[PDB]
């Protein structure tokens, strides 16, 4: 389970970056 | 209808290991835009600091003066809702009434009771009625507890004839996770433990119960501001004479869940105890039983259409049956059955109301129990049985059931009037030439205690039939 874990990590990082960008542009 | 925005085009349109320079170079800049911080209940479990931060965020957003030393503890800015588990009015209370239900991991009585009391204790009053009158009405709402204890002490036989039925007395404490209530419903033939097996009085939370509230907009009636009458009365109870009385901007507006149909006489009698009648609007004088049966059976009803159309077919002890309702049928009384399809329960101060509510409650309970036979049974064209009967509400709380008695070659009606609150009159009228298919007062009292139309139908088809 390497490819699935890497994809999950990449998706989590992208989601965290999007959330940080939204928090910085809103508040 | 696709998933191309998760890992295929989401990371490619985010506008690594050495591209995290977005905390100090691009930082030169909770309701519907930033859902990340708003979803604290989903990212982390409901804990002490999480709820304390959510409360502070909601207070800063909607507007509510409240603060503390730091994050980890937060009170409730209200008249007396200030209570910290584990001073501008009352002192810091730590009673079990607001510590039992919300002890460890409760998450229901945290945004409803507070918001409820905030919406209730809100009016155009500026430091004159938002706090003063609110606290006055909260303190005045304590004689009922003494009255409840007095009724419990006096009625030391059983909590069935005085608490639920007959009169008031099935009350509980109104604090924190439980508001004021009363024994509105009095269904005695429900699924019991097989007069409930309880150690003490019920808090009207185990199962189902109504919800009594105390609010008002223009019912500023004279009432006390503190409990004075607290001594044990002679037999049942005693009044509390006020007027130390000001125009407290409040009332006792409860929450009538269903528009129960009542009689004009009951509303007229109650319209002289607390000022005006129990409703100030255009009276929907439509078929009372027709709408009332649907309102009562609407709880269990599913999204599937029924389309009864004044048909009351139901089951039987070991077969199918049928029945009618005589709805929208103008009787010899002249005008049709008065309808009370309304939800206004704006009451007044607790004056001479020792039986102003219990009579209408028993009337509505009998009316509901009448149509109890038709809840979810839908079976037509039943050749066997079909003990069709039509409840003719000619007089107030006066029903009648027709059955094909073998005594005569016709139906057999019986006057069914609710004389007492649970002991209804179940007399009958036979024919000059008819066999003794009419039972005695024993089966009459049995049917009265049962108070179910289907029960009476089965009894007639089995006991009274004897064929």
């Amino acid at each position: 389970t390497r490819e699935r874990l890497l994809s999950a990590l990449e998706d989590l990082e992208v989601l965290s970056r999007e959330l940080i960008e939204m928090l910085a542009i809103s508040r | 209808l696709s998933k191309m925005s998760s890992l295929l085009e989401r990371l490619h349109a985010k506008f690594w290991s050495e591209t995290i320079k977005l905390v100090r170079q691009v930082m030169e800049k909770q309701h519907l835009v930033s859902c990340l911080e708003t979803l604290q209940k989903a990212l982390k479990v409901t804990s002490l600091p999480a709820m304390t931060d959510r409360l502070e965020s909601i207070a800063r957003q909607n507007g509510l003066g409240s603060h503390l030393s730091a994050s980890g503890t937060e009170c409730y800015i209200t008249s007396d809702m200030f209570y910290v588990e584990v001073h501008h009015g009352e002192n810091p209370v730590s009673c079990p009434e607001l510590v039992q239900q919300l002890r460890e991991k409760n998450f229901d009585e945290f945004s409803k009771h507070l918001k409820g009391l905030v919406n209730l204790y809100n009016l155009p009053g500026d430091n004159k009625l938002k706090t003063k009158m609110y606290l006055a009405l909260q303190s005045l709402e304590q004689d009922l507890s003494k009255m409840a204890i007095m009724y419990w002490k006096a009625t030391n036989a059983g909590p069935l004839d005085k608490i639920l039925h007959g009169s008031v007395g099935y009350l509980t404490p109104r604090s924190g996770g439980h508001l004021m209530n009363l024994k509105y419903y009095v269904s005695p033939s429900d699924l019991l433990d097989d007069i409930i097996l309880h150690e003490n009085n019920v808090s009207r939370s185990l199962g189902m119960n109504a919800s009594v509230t105390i609010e008002g907009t223009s019912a500023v009636y004279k009432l006390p501001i503190a409990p004075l009458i607290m001594g044990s009365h002679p037999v049942d109870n005693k009044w509390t004479p006020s007027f130390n009385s000001v125009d407290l901007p409040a009332c006792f507006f409860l929450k009538f869940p269903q528009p129960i149909p009542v009689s004009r006489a009951f509303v007229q009698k109650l319209q002289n105890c607390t000022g005006i009648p129990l409703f100030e609007t255009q009276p929907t004088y439509a078929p009372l039983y027709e709408l009332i049966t649907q309102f009562e059976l609407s709880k269990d009803p599913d999204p599937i259409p029924l389309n009864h159309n004044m048909r009351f077919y139901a089951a039987l002890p070991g077969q199918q049956h049928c029945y009618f309702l005589n709805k929208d049928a103008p009787l010899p009384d002249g005008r049709s059955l008065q309808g009370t399809l309304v939800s206004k329960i704006t009451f007044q101060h607790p004056g001479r109301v020792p039986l102003i509510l219990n009579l209408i409650r028993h009337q509505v309970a009998y009316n509901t129990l009448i149509g109890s036979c038709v809840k979810r049974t839908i079976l037509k064209e039943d050749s066997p049985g079909l003990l069709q009967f039509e409840v003719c509400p000619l007089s107030e709380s006066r029903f009648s059931v027709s059955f094909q008695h073998p005594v005569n070659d016709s139906l057999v009606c019986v006057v069914m009037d609710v004389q007492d609150s649970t002991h209804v009159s179940c007399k009958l009228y036979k024919g000059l030439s008819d066999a003794l298919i009419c039972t005695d007062d024993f089966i009459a009292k049995v049917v009265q205690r049962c108070m179910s139309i289907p029960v009476t139908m089965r009894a007639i088809r089995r006991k009274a039939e004897t064929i």
């Binding site: 389970t1 390497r2 874990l5 890497l6 990590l9 989590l12 990082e13 989601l15 965290s16 970056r17 959330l19 940080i20 960008e21 928090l23 910085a24 508040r27 | 290991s17 995290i20 977005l22 905390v23 930082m27 990340l36 911080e37 990212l43 982390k44």
Partner: protein, 73 residues
């Protein structure tokens, strides 16, 4: 991870390097997850493990039956 997103939001709306630490923690967690050894999905792995257990049980039963019935001379 709730803590990673919390640290990211803190470093974003505080006015440190929470993003670098979050990325390092995610890489360490991915390495620890891949450290197990099972490259393929665990479904076929469990199927093959059950098959191997059944085969081992059958072989043990056959060996016992062979070493039990010894009455020749």
């Amino acid at each position: 991870f709730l803590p990673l997103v919390h640290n990211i939001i803190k470093c974003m709306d505080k006015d440190q390097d929470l993003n670098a630490l979050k990325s390092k923690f995610q890489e360490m967690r991915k390495l620890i997850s891949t450290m197990p050894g099972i490259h393929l999905s665990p479904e076929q792995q469990q199927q093959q493990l059950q098959s191997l257990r059944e085969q081992v049980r059958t072989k043990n039963e056959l060996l016992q039956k062979y070493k039990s019935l010894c009455m020749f001379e």
